Amino acid sequence: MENFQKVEKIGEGTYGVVYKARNKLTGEVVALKKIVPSTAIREISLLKELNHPNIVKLLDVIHTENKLYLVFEFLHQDLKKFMDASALTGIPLPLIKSYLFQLLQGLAFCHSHRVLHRDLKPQNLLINTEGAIKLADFGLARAFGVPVRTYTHEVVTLWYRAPEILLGCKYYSTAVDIWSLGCIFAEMVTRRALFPGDSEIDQLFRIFRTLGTPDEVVWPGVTSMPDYKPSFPKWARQDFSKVVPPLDEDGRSLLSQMLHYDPNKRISAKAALAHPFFQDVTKPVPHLRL
Ligand SMILES: Nc1nc(N)c(N=O)c(OCC2CCCCC2)n1
């Protein structure tokens, strides 16, 4: 840590305080995350080779005195801040599309190397002035476990959690990131979170109230998951035209496939890249205030 000069405390991520810092020798500006058992060091260290334009680069892993600091590429704004700034107007559809498309490429790449994010949320999607969007914290939950409470004991968000995770599946897959991204896609479009649960049961029931209570007809095997209860209220599914009204039928069709209950049929990132919604995808530049 003597190689850096902390400029400002960017905020509090899942694992600790995130800082804006400057490398004392090179003068590079980086984001430094304060977070070790050997396993987690080997795993994180493997994440230093997982480079992609739509993945926030892990620059270095600093372990000093039982303290672990992750050094990432610095981006200029996170997506939550950008949506908050875009609230009265909403993010233009062509930019929403470019962003979805890029994030689907970042997920396709990590998922081809069998790496999952598991905790995708607007705060860990980072954007720059050239129109790029990148995922931060890729592969960290498997590396260290995503806590219930953060370092400040900030509530860990459940809003983007896939239903197989909430239902107790222990071996869930790369489909959980597609579910999260579909929720983030919905939120960009409507300017409201899709499923803002404030507890695990509320998260699930908000899901069930909009997509219908899952059963063996739409999700084979769901009735045998660990936390599934036959006493769940049985709600009817809602139309997607009511869920993300703004969106055209191609977008609603892709979102519906990203929010399939059954993880095995949920659309994969690579297959989502070929959906017709992306036929006229472009790369607009956001309007940023840094
Ligand atoms: N600028 C910047 N660059 C990063 N690479 C980065 N995370 O990886 C990051 O994170 C900013 C977030 C952290 C979570 C709380 C909300 C603010 N910022």
CATH of the domain at 193: 1.10.510.10
Q: Is 120 found in the same domain as 258?
A: yes
Beta bridge mates, 22: 5, 29
Domains identified in the chain, total number: 2
Q: Is 62 found in the same domain as 102?
A: no
Q: Is 139 found in the same domain as 266?
A: yes
- What is the strand order of the sheet 29-34 is part of? 4-12, 17-23, 29-34, 67-73, 58-64
Range of the domain at 200: 77-289
Nearest to 109 by CA among 286, 260, 269: 269
Beta bridge mates, 61: 70
Q: Is 101 found in the same domain as 64?
A: no
Q: Is 210 found in the same domain as 66?
A: no
Instruction: Tell me whether strands 77-78 and 125-127 are parallel, antiparallel or unpaired.
Output: antiparallel
Nearest CA to ligand 1 atom 7: 136
Q: How many CB atoms within 10 Å of residue 118?
A: 22
Q: Which residues are catalytic?
A: 119
Q: Is 105 found in the same domain as 49?
A: no
Q: Is 101 found in the same domain as 119?
A: yes
- The pair phi, psi for residue 7, each rounded to 5°, is -90, -45
Indicate which technique resolved this structure.
X-ray
Task: Please work out whether the CB of residue 78 comes within 6 Å of at least one atom of ligand 1.
Answer: yes
CATH of the domain at 4: 3.30.200.20
Q: Is 82 found in the same domain as 72?
A: no
Nearest CA to ligand 1 atom 8: 136
Q: Is 230 found in the same domain as 108?
A: yes
Residue 42 CA to residue 276 CA, distance in Å, equals 40
CA distances from 284 to 50, 80, 130, 137, 185 (A): 26, 18, 8, 25, 17
Q: Is 253 found in the same domain as 109?
A: yes
Q: Which of 76, 92, 125 is the last residue of a domain?
A: 76
Q: Is 56 found in the same domain as 129?
A: no
Distance 126 CA to ligand 1 centre (A): 7
**Is there a contact between 168 and 226 (Cβ–Cβ < 8 Å)?**
yes
Residue 91 CA to residue 83 CA, distance in Å, equals 7
Distance 252 CA to ligand 1 centre (A): 30
Q: Which residues contact 122 (CB under 8 A, 6 or more apart)?
A: 78, 79, 80, 83, 184, 187
